[PDB]
């Protein structure tokens, strides 16, 4: 499987979306599993889950790596509401235009916020819920905020540069040796590729700061089976939020990887894949 | 042969520091890599009672499974210990391995058994494979839970004043869903208490000689190089959830899994999930 | 100062209150400080703050030890709403009939929930906010619930007895030697004195379980200077809620006493008094 | 005499384990019970710089205040240490007390100074009065914060590549309200770095000989009998808030106070509150 071989597009229509073009990568048959990427500059479906797409399709699943509105190859956009909620509406739209009643969700950071919102708004359209360091869960009980990674994230959005990108990555990953010239230059080009997304993201932040993302109060509503994962060494989202989800979502479980940053499905792809696939198959 | 408590029941004499021709009872089945499961420290605890929902699946997965009765518990010989139990128990595990010609073994440890497993990993690093901890005890104070915790108070109350009712109360506190307690579970455990009364008295004499605080091996966790899998019940009223974090941060290569709607016994209350997760860990980690 | 010498009554009129008689103990002149008791059987204004009333009045404060509706000498009542909110309405009523525009609040357990609700509903009628192991803050991130103390609390309400009372007290206090025959028999008589309160409390619990008490979502609204105290060894309310309040209430501080149960103002009266009086005078 | 940095500036030669006629600089004023305040470990740290917002109020409250410059910092003599700094610094505090005929002293310690105070309480229990800890360092891993923390990364970066800009960045990370940084605070600290460059190099050589991990005295906290007051900034990006809990649970008689909207320096960013709380503790605890 490759980026282009799975590259596809589709227009959607929802509350705040009218003939909006959404990009994504598809492969495999069976139950549908929609993986949602984070909110960092240059983020995208394939770039974030290219190490999970293969194993999951083999496991007999229909994998869809979706590009959220205002990211990668999906159309640009400015949001007046918390991205979590808006992103979820975009998800429903993609499954409607594509005719998909049920879908398993896998979401990291912004993707996790999106997944949480989707489960709250459309509980009848979601299968199992998988969260990897989801964002927008309010204050941490131990970590000063904004967290290290968040400060670098906004810094990168407001003042894009190779240097700042690297600094963000060094804080993004636990094992510094994983930061290669290929990875650096790779995402570097992605950011410069579509600057409009960077500015639009910042404008949206103005309209809806992270505080409008906190859906903690509605966690008791989610009834979908949930699997929470966290990198023990995540400098972007607080580890204690993993406990928050574990205690407030009726049926959930928590798995924490050691020597792991904010990119668990990538830094510990093998264990992540085995765990989630096992979770989807037997849970 | 059918796999039952009786069909798997065996005994072996061990020799090690503090042990001379000491009889250890255990339940064994299967062939392949060795997995020794170590039980908790409550009155009436034993290998079979702790792990009867796990032995079958592990054997079927291709492992040689040994459910060991630690010294001073169930069918193993009686003893009054003057040293911390985790260390003494660890010496017993080595003694059993030596006696059965087992070079290396994966360890699964619950509570006292978890402390035992940690001591084993520290004292005999070349004799252990992977390390599985299920709510290990003796790791010192909690950063959030007042101590002694509910489960510990009932454990000591049962040791001093054994009764069927107090046993039921302790089991209830150790669970998330108290309705899961069966008449058969209670009866089996009550019989273990009634039929080996000396173990309760000896445990208390031992506890006075070596308080639970002497079980704390936190300071040496950084020495453990065995790949470790830590499991905890989100609703454990016996040992503190934050100790799972303590282990996750201090042991070099570990991962932590917390089960929701689960009391202290993750291996029992969430047996299927526990079995799948641990077997996957042993096979692919 | 004594119980009777400060014993007083007063009728109030609020949303769910019409000519409702509220009891309390008063002494001293100056700024008004209203202390609210916990929700355990036999609880009451004087019985819970008799070690703090003296020092505070001397500090130049007008101290009012209020009996919440359905407790001690105040009229009986059955609530259909979370007690925190109802209790706050009773507080406003007491200050209205008594003509008190501003008041400093000191609340333990149920009293803390009451204080939080009052600050949220009537922010223009509160001075400084002092919380001591306040209840109704949702799930704990570490403590299994119901907590040890809560189980004994309900056990005592449903099946009143000398034995259960003692067991509750042993879990209520850190230092077991403080449990004397005088204290035991003392509160024992108080409980049996008015059984109607016990049954009414249980009925109210049916109408509004602890889940309707969680006002966490509105903590960001409180602007009153807040002082949070917690017993390190509290087996009734989770220590991590102290951090919850510290992070969500704009201007707060946290003090944790070691070797201390769920009755901080009593178990560590001297330090508690110095700290809070200093807080009221200089904060 | 007016109380200024210069008017309080003094020097004393000390003799102790590892010290022979070693010159220690300190700032002193007041009379009464002795309170020795120990500074943090960042480049340019010193007694006056750490505590100039506290010395006046403490002296006015009736205490003899000594703001000590630890070995290898500010105006005290240079040194390359091969043992953990907290212990070596503690020996220096005793040396200073012996040289000045001070029998017992209350200690206030920030960061490295907090580690120093803990070591002092452990090694010389009969020479300490009350113990005040303000964000003490070297207490091992955090149960929640990834390490090294932001403040630690900047501290080591400044030690290796000193610059005014990196100094400002470090100070910003150590505060909650970054706008509180003044030109005078930065200039004073920058001068301490520029005028004693050897301290930065010696600190790094010392750190290689005795990593921060050797500073961890967690295992002995139960030995401390001094009444202890632990203070922490809720927004400390240098040392973890949960270590405040660690101290609260392991030290026999302690209390914990956490300031909101406060970075690492509770004594500086919330000076008035800190002064009132600590003075009340020394007087009535």
Question: Which experimental method was this entry solved with?
Answer: X-ray
Euclidean distance between CA atoms C139 and C214, whole angstroms: 9
Q: Is B11 on the interface with A (CB under 8 A)?
A: no
Q: How far is A111 from chain B (nearest CA, A)?
A: 22
Q: Is B250 on the interface with D (CB under 8 A)?
A: yes
Contact by Cβ (8 Å): B267, B51 = yes
Among the partner-chain residues D146, D240, D241, the one whose CB lies closest to the CB of A233 is D146
Residue whose pair of structure tokens reads 């950011």 in the numeric block: A191
Enumerate the active-site residues of B: 264
Q: Is C200 annotated as a binding residue?
A: no
| C118: Cβ contacts below 8 Å, ≥ 6 apart | C88, C91, C92, C105, C125, C126
Long-range contacts of D267-274 (CB under 8 A, 24+ apart): D267/D50, D267/D51, D267/D53, D267/D54, D267/D108, D267/D110, D267/D134, D267/D231, D268/D50, D268/D53, D269/D175, D269/D176, D269/D177, D269/D180, D269/D233, D270/D233, D271/D53, D271/D54, D272/C282, D273/C253, D273/C283, D274/D54, D274/D134, D274/D231
B contact test, residue of C144, C150, C256 with most B CBs within 10 A: C144
Among the partner-chain residues C254, C270, C282, the one whose CB lies closest to the CB of D258 is C254
| B146·C232 Cβ contact <8 A | yes
**Is residue D68 helix, strand or coil?**
strand
| B280·A258 Cβ contact <8 A | no
CA dihedral in degrees (B89, B95, B97, B103; nearest 10)? 110
Shortest CA distance from B253: residue in chain A: A258
Question: Which chains, if any, share at least 3 CB pairs under 8 A with chain B?
Answer: A, C, D
Residue C87 is encoded by which pair of tokens? 């209790």
Go through C25-51 and write b for each residue having 16 or more CB atoms within 10 A of its CB, e for each that does not.
Answer: bbbbeebbbbbbbbbbbbbbbbbbbbb
| C209: Cβ contacts below 8 Å, ≥ 6 apart | none
Resolution (A): 1.6
DSSP secondary structure, A156-205, as one string: HHHS--HHHHHHHHHHH-S-GGG--HHHHHHHHHHHHH-HHHHHHHHHHH
> Rg of chain B's alpha carbons, rounded to an integer?
17
Residue C156 is encoded by which pair of tokens? 């005592």
Among the partner-chain residues C140, C233, C240, the one whose CB lies closest to the CB of B146 is C233
**Domains observed in chain D:** 1-285 (3.40.50.1820)
Euclidean distance between CA atoms B73 and D216, whole angstroms: 37
**Is residue B90 helix, strand or coil?**
helix
Residue C35 is encoded by which pair of tokens? 């202390």
For residue A203, cis peptide bond before it (omega within 30 degrees of 0): no
Euclidean distance between CA atoms D83 and C268, whole angstroms: 41
Euclidean distance between CA atoms B138 and B148, whole angstroms: 11
Residue whose pair of structure tokens reads 């990364």 in the numeric block: D153
Euclidean distance between CA atoms D36 and B99, whole angstroms: 61
Question: Phi-psi region for residue D138, left (φ > 0), alpha (ψ -120 to 50) or beta?
Answer: left
Nearest by Cα to A210 from A149, A150, A277: A150
Binding residues of A for substrate: 39-40, 48, 108, 177, 187, 263
């Amino acid at each position: 499987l490759t980026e282009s071989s799975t590259s596809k597009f589709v227009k959607i229509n929802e509350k705040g979306f009218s003939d909006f073009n959404i990009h994504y990568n598809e492969a495999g048959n069976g139950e549908t599993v929609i993986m949602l990427h984070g909110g960092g500059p240059g983020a995208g479906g394939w770039s974030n889950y290219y190490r999970n797409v293969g194993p999951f399709v083999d496991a007999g699943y229909r994998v869809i790596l979706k590009d959220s509105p205002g990211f990668n190859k999906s159309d640009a956009v400015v949001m007046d509401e918390q991205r979590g909620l808006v992103n979820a509406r975009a998800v429903k739209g993609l499954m409607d235009a594509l005719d998909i009643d049920r879908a398993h969700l896998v979401g990291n950071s912004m993707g996790g916020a999106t997944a949480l919102n989707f489960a709250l708004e459309y509980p009848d359209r979601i299968g199992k819920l998988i969260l990897m360091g989801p964002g927008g869960l309010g204050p941490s009980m131990f970590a000063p905020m904004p967290m290290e990674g968040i400060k670098l994230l906004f810094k990168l959005y407001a003042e894009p540069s190779y240097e700042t990108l690297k600094q963000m990555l060094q804080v993004f990953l636990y094992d510094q040796s994983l930061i290669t010239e290929e990875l650096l230059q790779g995402r570097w080009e992605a950011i410069q590729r579509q600057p409009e997304h960077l500015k639009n993201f910042l404008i949206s932040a103005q309209k809806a700061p992270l505080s409008t993302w906190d859906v903690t109060a509605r966690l008791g509503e989610i009834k979908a089976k949930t699997f929470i994962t966290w990198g023990r060494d995540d400098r972007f989202v607080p580890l204690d939020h993993g406990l928050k989800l574990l205690w407030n979502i009726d049926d959930a479980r928590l798995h924490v990887f050691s020597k792991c940053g904010h990119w668990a499905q990538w830094e510990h792809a093998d264990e992540f894949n085995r765990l989630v696939i096992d979770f989807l198959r037997h849970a």
